[PDB]
């Protein structure tokens, strides 16, 4: 004879479903912080992998049309584990390239200040 146990279990099951949706919503959106541009995707192509990430960005964001919503967790885990296998000396080559990258644009900063 259960009483307030099915309500506790239904709250526990509804709590579990919310934990699955928030984590699997998006990696970048869930962690931390763009305008729609089909002309920028058209200009960037004018090479195939760049067009794939452009359509992926337009789909997640949803002059902007949505459509793509069928492209799951198990196939991504095996894809991540396989690429990790393919990837001291590797630590120094990443530190040197990060120092090189550390070593038009002015109009955006002025407008950022005009907002401030």
């Amino acid at each position: 004879e259960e009483r307030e146990i099915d309500d506790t279990y239904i709250e526990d099951a509804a709590d579990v479903d919310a934990r699955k949706q928030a984590i699997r919503d998006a990696e970048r959106v869930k962690e931390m912080k763009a305008v729609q541009k089909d002309l920028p995707r058209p200009s960037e192509v004018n090479l195939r992998p760049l067009n794939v990430e452009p359509p992926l960005t337009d789909l997640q964001k949803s002059t902007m049309l949505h459509y793509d919503l069928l492209h799951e967790p198990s196939g991504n885990k095996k894809g991540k584990t396989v690429g990790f296998g393919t990837n001291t000396y590797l630590e120094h080559n990443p530190y040197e390239k990060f120092s090189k990258e550390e070593l038009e644009s002015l109009e955006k900063r002025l407008e950022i200040n005009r907002g401030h």
Binding site: P49, G83, K97, E101, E102
Partner: protein, 132 residues
């Protein structure tokens, strides 16, 4: 503004010369007559050692304001010392972003060599199988 012994607004403030603190004359006088000591630090103090609050001498003062040159200079310290911490918030957060970018661009550079080989292998399997 307050007397440290009672907690009232003292009507005759006299400052001691062993523990620097503004006491009410009538209160501190009784404290000295009880035992020759300063109430806070318990150091020796007599009634002649105590000194009333006075106008400085002959130089005229003005109240502490934002105009006054020394108050304006200590203000500009607050400005810069706060802005110096504002720089740390952006120096420390930059060292996390560039560290995550370095590992991100390395995982991108380690992965895109595997995209190039699968595009080779899946097309080579289509080139091989279709010919047979």
């Amino acid at each position: 503004l307050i007397c440290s012994i009672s907690n009232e607004v003292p009507e005759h403030p006299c400052v001691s010369p062993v523990s620097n603190h503004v006491y009410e004359r009538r209160l501190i006088e009784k404290y000295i007559a009880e035992n020759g000591t300063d109430p806070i630090n318990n150091q020796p103090l007599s009634e002649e050692q105590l000194i009333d609050i006075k106008v400085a001498h002959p130089i005229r003062p003005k109240p502490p304001s934002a105009t006054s040159i020394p108050a304006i200079l200590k203000a500009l310290q607050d400005e810069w010392d706060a802005v110096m911490l504002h720089s740390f918030t952006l120096r420390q957060q930059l060292q996390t972003t560039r560290q995550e970018l370095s590992h991100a661009l390395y995982q991108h550079d380690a992965a895109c060599r595997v995209i190039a080989r699968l595009t080779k292998e899946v097309t080579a399997a289509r080139e091989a199988l279709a010919t047979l």
